[PDB]
Amino acid sequence: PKLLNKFDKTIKAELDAAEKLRKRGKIEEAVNAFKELVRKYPQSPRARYGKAQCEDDLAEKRRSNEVLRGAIETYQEVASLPDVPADLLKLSLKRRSDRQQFLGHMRGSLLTLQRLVQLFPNDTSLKNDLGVGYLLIGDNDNAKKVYEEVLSVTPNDGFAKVHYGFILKAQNKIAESIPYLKEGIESGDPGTDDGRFYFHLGDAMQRVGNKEAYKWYELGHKRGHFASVWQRSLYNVNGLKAQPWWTPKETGYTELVKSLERNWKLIRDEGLAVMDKAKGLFLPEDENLREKGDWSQFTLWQQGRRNENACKGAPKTCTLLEKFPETTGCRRGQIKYSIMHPGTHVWPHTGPTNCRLRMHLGLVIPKEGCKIRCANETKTWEEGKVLIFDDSFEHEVWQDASSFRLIFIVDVWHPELTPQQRRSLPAI
């Protein structure tokens, strides 16, 4: 990496001295060293970059966002100085984009990546990095435009293939997405051994009927992405007990189960009240999990937060659930009514995390046609009874009755999770 211009070469001694202090670990002593090199040589790109790396390392030690916001600015100052080496320009701005995403300034990291692509229009990897910026902000349209430009120049790039296939699969182009995912994973290129692409390639093959989906599930299990071929969640805490079906006494939430089963009729009546007088509060499933049919949900708690407007439609149920922090505080689960109408088949899928167990309270259950499979066992609901299963295992639902099926979903923390974990885990 050529990082010194002509003027910095004349002061390589003072630069390497302060760089040693940063490498030795005296981050405080190195910051003040580069700070005075900048004060002494205000146009040195390396001394400005060295000040930025010290602020970066210092922000790690102090765990400060304000210090990291200072490094982000110093990384930009290296780009304003004159006669800056091209390799130093890429590293200074790429680190700014990376740290901007760390803080959540996703819109700012996009602008920084756009500048890099405008400065280096031939770097394929920089365009690929810009595509990831769009996928982190939710702009799959512009992400597809980028990875199309990459594949028109470098059509053998696996990184662009798996991301192009991920967008096509997100856009319900299931058949077209498979070749981009299978080839990108097999490219072996850096960044293609991600469990997300194994999960979506096997899911895409399952919907089209290709039995080789489980060969890709087992391969992801061998490389450490999946806990098993059945438990394919990706936001996981290692060590938790894993079994597809649980019993109430096994979970330890016996007080919650009894409150639900003792008072199931009031929960049902408040849900039917929303059905009859506020259909708008039931929103359709929006995760493309349906092959066919109508499936709506009326959410009361999400990510540990209570929807005040929703609890105005089911007040007694919200008051009942208020007594149990094991479900109201589950920031990786929800509490919702789930209505499913005849002719509905939900694709085999997996929940995002293993940190929650999912409870189903039977409210309005038709006598035939309804059944849910988790792993290799199929069970059915019963009115006034609670089913408990680990939705991180592959599960599948059919509804082929002559009337609607209404259940109550209550997510709880995994019982083996420590309270420190329940308070620290990022919400999902």
Binding site: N65, L68, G104, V132, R196, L234, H349, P352
Partner: peptide
């Protein structure tokens, strides 16, 4: 958001340290 499934590139939000 990832609720019953996992159809998003990232299911969490970054907020720094």
């Amino acid at each position: 958001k990832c609720k019953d499934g996992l159809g998003e590139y990232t299911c969490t939000s970054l907020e720094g340290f």
